Structures are given as structure tokens and as C-alpha cells.
Design a protein around this nucleic acid. Structure first.
Ligand SMILES: Cc1cn([C@H]2C[C@H](O)[C@@H](COP(=O)(O)OP(=O)(O)OP(=O)(O)O)O2)c(=O)[nH]c1=O
Ligand SMILES: [Ca+2]
Ligand SMILES: [Ca+2]
Ligand SMILES: [Ca+2]
Ligand SMILES: [Ca+2]
Ligand SMILES: [Ca+2]
Length: 902
DNA sequence: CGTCGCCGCCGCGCGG
DNA sequence: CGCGCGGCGGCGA
């Protein structure tokens, strides 16, 4: 097989590499890598190396990596550019793997672990590590085994061995309900003392050294706790055994306020699942406890135990160990669903970077572009220093707040990357500038043609047309990968709807789910078999369709994020190819493209319907337009439609056969106007929205920019079995809005759009009546706990103190002098509740760490002093009034002349 | 060391 | 609660 790397590190003048050899064996080597860097040379001397601008370069081969670094410093002191890849391990990887990497994941050792630490005096700080580690569960992907290390004897209690028999039993039998599919995969090792547990763990680590190391909070907690505990007991050298090259670094993480120290383990790639989840999941959660994320992702019940975790080992060691094993497995289950490890490996090997560098798109694109340029013997420019400067972004149209009955949306495919490709925007393709007219002049086609030679953007930039730049070239490859996965995702989604439709008539029989590839549209023979299946088999198929859809979602959305991040990188000072002329050329072209096509769509539809000056486009943001279709529906008449699906088909056909061709003509004209290299403005229909036929639903509404709701029947070719709410910006979508409030507001909007004013008033009245019975967590707001110390004046709110920080300060005063109470962590999430006047907490609100029940010390007093009236008015009534005034509805029945009879 | 636009809640200081 | 400005948090693209 083709060799591939596992990990790479620079240590002094050595590269340390772990890799899989041609036989599929893991090896390690130390190479005294001789790096090359480059300097511009005279035009007359013969060379095969050229910088991106076509300037001749001479190669400088160095005796070692330290020489290369010192040369860079001398070139600065002289005042001359030192070209080439200064991250020597990326250059090593490029030299060693001078081909497209085919990797085999089954050869890569992925480790998932978590630890337990009993602590009677508060949170066990990793940097101190003064408490014994009493449990480690470490899953190995190559062995497919959970290795459990269990401490029987501790200064905090002597315990009996964990029983695998009781662990396997149901909770109703007094067992722990450890899933039966992992019971046979557990290798349990009890220890008489902590020293022997840790020594054995290190020996185990040595035999089965992680390549990818993951888990939940392993970077912030598990890794540093284990490193420091071993350091405190045995000394630094023993702790350094967690690195296969015995080198570690104790380094700070800096964003802004405060600092925390993480441990870098050389020769290991740490991918903390929390960080993977935060970057790749496209959620913002109220809580990041594993309980919370597990319940959200997998629909599994929280891990249930009595008393504080500080007493769980002592009171119920059996459950303590089982819950440690389950915690590890739950991260595995999330990953089997989300597939973030697979994504990381894919992106990592594609760019030829350390796998952990997937968190950094700048690093990712730096390596992609370097490998692409190196292939042609081209030399990358030196990184320069730039001051941060603001620059303009997208156009957002001010909507008229209103209800909107029939709506069709259109959207440009992968806009910013397509602008890059269409215009040919790259560092080496800059051709010059033209004199700029006001943007509205380009939008209205009255400004003079920018160039008869080069490809232009309305910001004044001009680009070569003879050849593709490296940025368009490399962004195209990833875009094409994105497109494949999106296709798989949408087909899985369409297949899902076929199963949903069939579930309305489930046949009664014992059968099995069909063995099908959900990434491809179901054939006719498959569709017919589904129609004859039982609810049980259909449900399993729906689950599988939905898992296939999620996998597709991960692959496509994160490839989209990567290509969009290349646009973003052009506007970040740390990017090698930072250039505000290029970033602005993209965003300005975008503003033109949107407003240009608004004009065209309006002009076209006014021609179709026979009017003048009527605005059909009601809204647009960046790359999408929202078109009012009332008049199109009205031109045939609502009475001519059999049912909802009929007018939906009509609009679908109208958009595809009439509007899209016109849209294309308008964009082809724009391409010619700007003299662009290639026409790539592809605007397809996205949503078809409206009320159910014969109902009093309003269909949709806008309250303002970025704030709207639509009742959607068809989304990019997916015809839904049941109409689906597209809600953007509104309180239903914010992680800060209480869960019960999100749910209620969503049902209010559902009723408005699908059923009408009367239905909405019924629901509101009922919600107002029953509100006070809602569980306190379901009605707590959520916020992020930033800058606590800034507004802390002696435990009391300082000037300008934010509402949620006031609540934290209240909490801190309430729990002061108690080691056992959960501390609020700087930068983490908190639940927030209003407090009635005259409460014993001495303030108007209280906040506590999210994902948790509030400590039993203050729970009783919070529930008694919770201000339901303020809660209802602020998080529910105010937003609903906002919705209803925008939609011209009343959420309370106004009096009428009829209130006079019967 | 991906980006900008723009919403609503809040504290503050008005607003005769 | 009437208003706008700046801080903040959090989305929508
Ligand atoms: C979501 C997102 C968009 N944008 C910018 C770039 C996008 O091209 C533009 C429009 O966003 P979107 O319409 O959300 O996405 P898209 O057009 O790039 O991809 P799709 O084919 O799925 O429609 O907004 C970012 O810069 N960063 C982001 O994270
Ligand atoms: Ca735990
Ligand atoms: Ca788009
Ligand atoms: Ca689309
Ligand atoms: Ca059937
Ligand atoms: Ca869009």
C-alpha cells in the first residue's frame, strides 16, 4: 500500500515522524531534514524556481533547520524577502508525500478516554492535581476494546471490584444498563494502589500509543490532570512518557480575558471532541456537558445518580465505574453519527498538515496552496505583518414588515467561492485597477464598462483572464468535493420523505428493512417495496436515511465552511495571502450581483404580469432573494387548484421553466459587463412557501432584516410530507431563549402561518394560563459568562454590569464559603432567572452553570422567588407582540359588536 | 489567528 | 416606558 504519515513534529534539527509503512505497519523515524528556502535572484541567471509573480528565485539548501531559521532573521535585518515554507514540517510532509495521500483509517490508532477524580474540596484543578485518579477508561480503535483502570484503594475510600455482571443488568434489576454491544469489549483491570495504576497505564500507553487522542474535555481536563498527577508522583520524565518522543510543552491559551494552560504532547494529535463539536456541528447549545449533548444528539437519558459526584465512588462504586465507561462510549456514538474524526482525517491528509491543524483554516489553506504551487516549482511569498483594518461585506435589503402569503426564494450556489472562480481573484492574478463609479451605476447598467481586457469587480480591481490563479484552482477542487456530498445529503433527505409518506399506511407483517444505499434516490422497485412494509421496518429505514443525511451534512457543510474560510482568510492579517483588495473585490461583486438580479427579476415579473414599478422582490440577504408570488397564484386563481401540492407544483414549474432561464440571462449579461473569466453565477430556486389551501394561515412574515418565518412545502427539490417552518433570526432560533419559550413561540408561529388569527389566540390564552407550571430549567434564559471579574466590585455589580453577570454575582454571594457548590466558569454558559422584589438573594436575578440543576443549597429559594410575571412578559409576550404587529394580527381577541347577544 | 451585517436586551443618561 | 448610544451576545449570511 501507499505510505502515509500519522504525526509529524520538529524538535530542534530533527523531524520526528510516525507513519504507516508500505506494509501497513506503524513506524517511527528521526530525520535530520535539510530544508530549502529561497531568495530573488538576477533576471539573467538560469533557474527553475519562480515566485507567484514570475520572478526568478534561487534555492538555498541549509545544513539543518536551525540554520534556515537564522537565515530568515538575517534577511529581516538586511531588509530582503525570505521566500518559501518556513514551517519546516509542512515542507518535510510535502517532500515525503509527493502524491495524493490515500490513508487507511483502520491503521490509525484513535483513542477515546476519560478519567475520574474524587474531590471533597471543590473542582479538581489539573494544574495542581492533588487528588488521586481513581478511574480511567481508555477505548482503543484498533483493538476495539475499552480498557478500564479502576482504583480500589484511595485516601477517599476503599472499594470492591466493579462487577461486569451487574453493569450489564437493567436499571430495573439494580444494574447500570451498560449497552450489551460493548459488554464483551471491556477489559477490566483493578488496582490496589494509584502508583501501580498509573505505572501500568503508562506501559499500556507505550504499547498502544494514540495517534488521534480524543474524548470530552480531554484537552482542558483529562490530559493535563493525568500529566500533572504523574508529574507530582513520579517526576517530569515519567510524565513525558505520554509523548512518544518524550517532549512536552506547558503552554497558555490566549483569546482575550484570562488564561489557561494546556499540555502539548509531541507526536500525538489531540482532537478534543468538544472542540470538534463546536467547530463542525453548526449548533450553539445552552450547555456543553456530555449529558446535554448526548441527549441532544442520540436521545439518550441523562446519567442518573444520587448525591454529589464527590461521594459517588464511596456510596456506589459500581455505578461510578459503569458511568465512566458509558461516558466514553457516548462520545463514540456521537462520532459514529456526526463523523467529525473522519472529516478531520480527510481534510488533514488532503492539505498535508498535522491533523490537529484542521481547527485552523488559515493553516489548512496555507498548506494546500503551498503544495499546489510546489508542484509547479513555484515559491511562496514570505508572511508579512499587517495592521487589522475593517472592510465592507454583504448587502441586506430592508424588508417592509408584513405578512407575505406566497413566497418563492432563489439562492446563488456557493457565492463567494464562485465569485473567486468567475472573477479569477488570486494574489498572482491582480492586473491593476480601474476608475470606480458608484455601485448603483453598475447595478443599473449605466456605468462605463470597466475593462475590455481584464476581469473586473465593481470595487475597482482587475484580474488576468489568460490563466486560473492558484486560489480559484484550489477552491474549485474542494468546492467539487462539497458538491458531491451535498448531492448525497439531499438524496438521503428526499428518501426520508418517501419513508415518512409511507408511514401513514404501514402494512401489518413481520419483515426486514430493505438493504439500500440511502445516498441515491430510491428506484421504482424500492418505492413499491417500501409501500408494503411494516411500521417497524419503515422506522428503522427512516433512522438509517436520517443517519445517511447527517453524514452527508457533515461532509458537505464543513467543505463549504472551508472554502468560505478561504475568502475569510483573505481578510485575516495572519494569512500569507492576506489582501484587502481581494476580500473587498469579492464582497463588493456580491453586493452588485444581488442588487443586479433584484432589478432583473422585478423587470421580468412586471413584464409577465403587465405592470410597472411593482416590487416583486421583498427581501434579500447577501446572495438570496425572496419573491412575492401572490400575483402569480392570482393570475390563475386559487379556485383552479385541487390541493396545496397542486399550487406548489405550479410554482415549482414556473420557477424552473420561466424564472430561472430569465435569471440566467440577467447574470450572463452581468458577466459580460464585468468582462469576467467564466460565468458561474448560478441562482436556483430554494423555497416555496404559502398557507395550506383553504386555510386562514398567513403563510409567512418578516419583522425586519434577518427576522422572518415561512411555511415551506418544498426546499431545493425536497417535497416535504409535512410542511416545515423556516424561521430565521426570531427568538425560536436563539440558544438564549428558554426552551419552553422556544417551543411555545414556534407553535404560535406555526398557528399564524398554517391556521390563522383565531387559532393563535386560542393557544396564547392557554399558554398564559399554564405558564407557571413549567419546570424552572425550561423557562430559564441562557447566556455566556464573559468578563465576570471586570464588573466585580467586592461581590457586587459595578458600573454598566450586564444583567446576566449581575445574576452570576448574586449566585457567587449565595454560595460564598462553600467548597462543594459548582463555581461559574469564565466564558461558559449560565442559566438566568429573574427574582421577585424582596427576595433573600438581595438582587433582581440569579444565574448558575448551565446543564445542571442549581445546587440544593439555594434551589428551594430560587423556585419560590422566581419571577414568572417578568419571565412571561420579557421572553414570551414581547417577542410575540413583535411577530403579530409585523403580521398585522392580534394575539388577543379584540372586542366586537357581537359581544352584545346570547 | 476565516469574514461582515445587524438584530434585541440592557444600563445609562437623558428627555424640559 | 419614551428615546438613542455603546456593550454584549448571538445569529444570518
Ligand atoms: C454561512 C457563511 C456564509 N458566508 C458568506 C459566503 C457565502 O458564499 C455567502 C452566502 O452564504 P450561504 O447562502 O449560506 O452559502 P453559499 O452560497 O456559500 O453556499 P450554498 O451553496 O449552500 O448556498 O455568505 C461566509 O462568509 N461564511 C459563512 O460561514
Ligand atoms: Ca465523570
Ligand atoms: Ca447560497
Ligand atoms: Ca441552492
Ligand atoms: Ca403501505
Ligand atoms: Ca443564502
Amino acid at each position: 500500500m501507499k505510505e502515509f504519515y500519522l504525526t509529524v513534529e520538529q524538535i530542534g534539527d530533527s523531524i520526528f515522524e510516525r507513519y504507516i509503512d508500505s506494509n501497513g505497519r506503524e513506524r517511527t523515524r528521526e530525520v535530520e531534514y535539510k530544508p530549502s528556502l529561497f531568495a530573488h535572484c538576477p533576471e539573467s541567471q538560469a533557474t527553475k524556481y519562480f515566485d507567484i509573480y514570475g520572478k526568478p528565485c534561487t534555492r538555498k539548501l541549509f545544513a539543518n533547520m536551525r540554520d534556515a531559521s537564522q537565515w530568515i532573521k538575517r534577511m529581516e535585518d538586511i531588509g530582503l524577502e525570505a521566500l518559501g515554507m518556513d514551517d519546516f514540517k509542512l515542507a518535510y510532509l510535502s517532500d515525503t508525500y509527493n502524491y495524493e495521500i490515500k490513508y487507511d483509517h483502520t491503521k490509525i490508532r484513535v483513542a477515546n478516554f476519560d478519567i475520574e477524580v474524587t474531590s471533597p474540596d471543590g473542582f479538581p484543578e489539573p494544574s495542581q492535581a492533588k487528588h488521586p485518579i481513581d478511574a480511567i477508561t481508555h477505548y482503543d480503535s484498533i483493538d476495539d476494546r475499552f480498557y478500564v483502570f479502576d482504583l480500589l484503594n484511595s485516601p477517599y475510600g476503599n472499594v470492591e471490584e466493579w462487577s461486569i455482571e451487574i453493569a450489564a443488568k437493567l436499571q430495573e434489576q439494580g444494574g447500570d444498563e451498560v449497552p450489551s454491544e460493548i459488554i464483551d469489549k471491556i477489559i477490566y483491570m483493578p488496582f490496589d494502589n494509584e502508583k501501580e495504576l498509573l505505572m501500568e497505564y503508562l506501559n499500556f500507553w507505550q504499547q498502544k500509543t494514540p495517534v488521534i487522542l480524543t474524548g470530552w474535555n480531554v484537552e482542558s481536563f483529562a490530559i493535563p490532570y493525568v500529566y500533572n498527577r504523574i508529574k507530582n508522583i513520579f517526576g517530569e520524565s515519567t510524565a513525558k512518557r505520554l509523548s512518544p518522543h518524550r517532549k512536552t510543552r506547558v503552554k497558555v491559551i490566549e483569546n482575550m480575558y484570562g488564561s489557561r494552560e494546556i499540555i502539548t504532547l509531541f507526536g500525538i494529535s489531540v482532537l478534543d471532541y468538544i472542540d470538534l463539536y463546536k467547530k463542525f456541528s453548526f449548533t450553539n447549545q445552552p450547555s456543553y456537558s456530555l449529558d446535554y449533548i448526548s441527549e441532544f444528539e442520540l436521545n439518550v437519558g441523562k446519567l442518573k445518580y444520587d448525591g454529589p459526584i464527590s461521594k459517588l465512588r464511596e456510596s456506589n462504586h459500581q455505578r461510578y465505574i459503569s458511568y465512566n465507561i458509558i461516558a466514553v462510549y457516548r462520545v463514540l456514538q456521537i462520532d459514529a453519527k456526526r463523523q467529525f474524526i473522519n472529516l478531520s482525517l480527510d481534510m488533514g491528509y488532503y492539505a498535508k498538515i498535522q491533523i490537529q491543524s484542521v481547527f485552523s483554516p488559515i493553516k489548512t489553506w496555507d498548506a494546500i496552496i503551498f503544495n499546489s504551487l510546489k508542484e509547479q516549482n513555484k515559491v511562496i511569498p514570505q508572511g508579512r505583518s499587517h495592521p487589522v483594518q475593517p472592510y465592507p461585506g454583504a448587502f441586506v435589503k430592508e424588508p417592509i414588515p408584513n405578512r407575505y402569503k406566497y413566497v418563492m426564494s432563489f439562492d446563488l450556489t456557493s457565492l463567494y467561492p464562485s465569485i473567486i472562480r468567475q472573477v479569477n481573484i488570486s494574489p498572482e492574478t491582480i492586473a491593476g485597477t480601474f476608475k470606480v463609479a458608484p455601485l448603483h451605476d453598475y447595478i443599473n447598467a449605466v456605468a462605463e464598462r470597466p475593462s475590455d481586457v481584464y476581469s473586473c469587480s465593481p470595487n475597482g480591481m482587475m484580474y488576468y483572464k489568460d490563466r486560473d490563479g492558484v486560489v480559484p484552482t484550489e477552491i474549485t477542487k474542494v468546492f467539487n468535493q462539497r458538491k458531491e456530498h451535498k448531492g448525497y445529503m439531499l438524496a438521503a433527505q428526499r428518501n426520508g420523505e418517501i419513508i415518512k409518506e409511507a408511514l401513514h399506511n404501514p402494512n401489518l407483517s413481520v419483515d426486514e428493512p430493505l438493504d439500500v444505499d440511502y445516498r441515491f434516490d430510491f428506484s421504482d422497485e424500492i418505492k413499491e417495496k417500501i409501500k408494503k412494509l411494516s411500521a417497524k421496518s419503515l422506522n428503522e429505514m427512516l433512522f438509517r436515511a436520517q443517519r445517511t443525511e447527517v453524514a452527508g451534512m457533515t461532509a458537505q457543510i464543513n467543505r463549504k465552511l472551508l472554502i468560505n474560510s478561504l475568502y475569510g482568510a483573505l481578510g485575516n492579517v495572519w494569512f500569507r495571502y492576506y489582501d484587502l483588495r481581494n476580500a473587498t473585490a469579492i464582497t463588493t461583486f456580491g453586493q452588485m450581483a444581488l442588487q443586479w438580479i433584484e432589478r432583473k427579476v422585478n423587470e421580468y415579473l412586471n413584464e409577465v404580469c403587465g405592470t410597472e414599478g411593482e416590487a416583486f422582490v421583498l427581501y434579500g440577504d447577501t446572495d438570496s432573494i425572496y419573491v412575492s408570488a401572490d400575483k402569480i397564484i392570482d393570475k390563475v386563481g386559487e379556485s383552479k387548484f385541487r390541493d396545496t401540492n397542486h399550487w406548489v407544483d405550479f410554482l415549482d414549474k414556473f420557477a424552473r421553466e420561466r424564472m430561472e432561464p430569465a435569471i440566467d440571462r440577467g447574470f450572463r449579461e452581468m458577466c459580460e459587463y464585468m468582462n469576467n473569466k467564466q460565468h458561474l453565477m448560478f441562482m436556483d430556486r430554494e423555497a416555496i412557501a404559502g398557507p395550506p389551501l383553504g386555510s386562514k394561515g398567513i403563510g409567512g412574515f418578516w419583522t425586519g432584516k434577518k427576522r422572518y418565518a415561512l411555511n415551506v412545502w418544498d426546499m431545493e427539490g425536497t417535497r416535504y410530507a409535512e410542511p416545515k417552518l423556516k424561521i430565521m433570526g426570531l427568538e425560536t432560533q436563539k440558544s438564549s431563549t428558554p426552551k419552553a419559550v422556544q417551543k411555545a413561540l414556534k407553535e404560535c408561529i406555526r398557528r399564524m402561518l398554517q391556521e390563522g388569527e383565531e387559532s393563535l389566540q386560542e393557544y396564547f390564552k392557554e399558554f398564559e394560563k399554564e405558564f407557571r407550571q413549567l419546570n424552572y430549567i425550561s423557562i430559564a434564559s441562557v447566556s455566556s459568562a464573559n468578563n465576570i471579574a471586570k464588573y466585580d466590585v467586592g461581590g457586587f455589580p459595578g458600573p454598566k454590569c450586564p444583567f446576566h453577570i449581575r445574576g452570576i454575582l448574586t449566585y457567587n454571594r449565595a454560595i460564598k464559603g462553600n467548597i462543594d457548590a459548582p463555581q461559574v466558569v469564565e466564558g461558559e454558559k449560565v442559566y438566568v432567572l429573574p427574582l421577585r422584589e424582596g427576595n433573600p438573594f438581595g438582587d433582581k436575578c440569579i444565574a448558575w452553570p448551565s446543564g445542571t440543576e442549581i445546587t440544593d443549597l439555594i434551589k428551594d429559594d430560587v423556585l419560590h422567588w422566581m419571577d414568572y410575571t417578568v419571565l412571561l412578559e420579557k421572553t414570551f409576550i414581547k417577542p410575540l407582540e413583535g411577530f403579530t404587529s409585523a403580521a398585522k394580527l392580534d394575539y388577543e381577541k379584540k372586542a366586537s359588536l357581537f359581544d352584545m347577544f346570547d
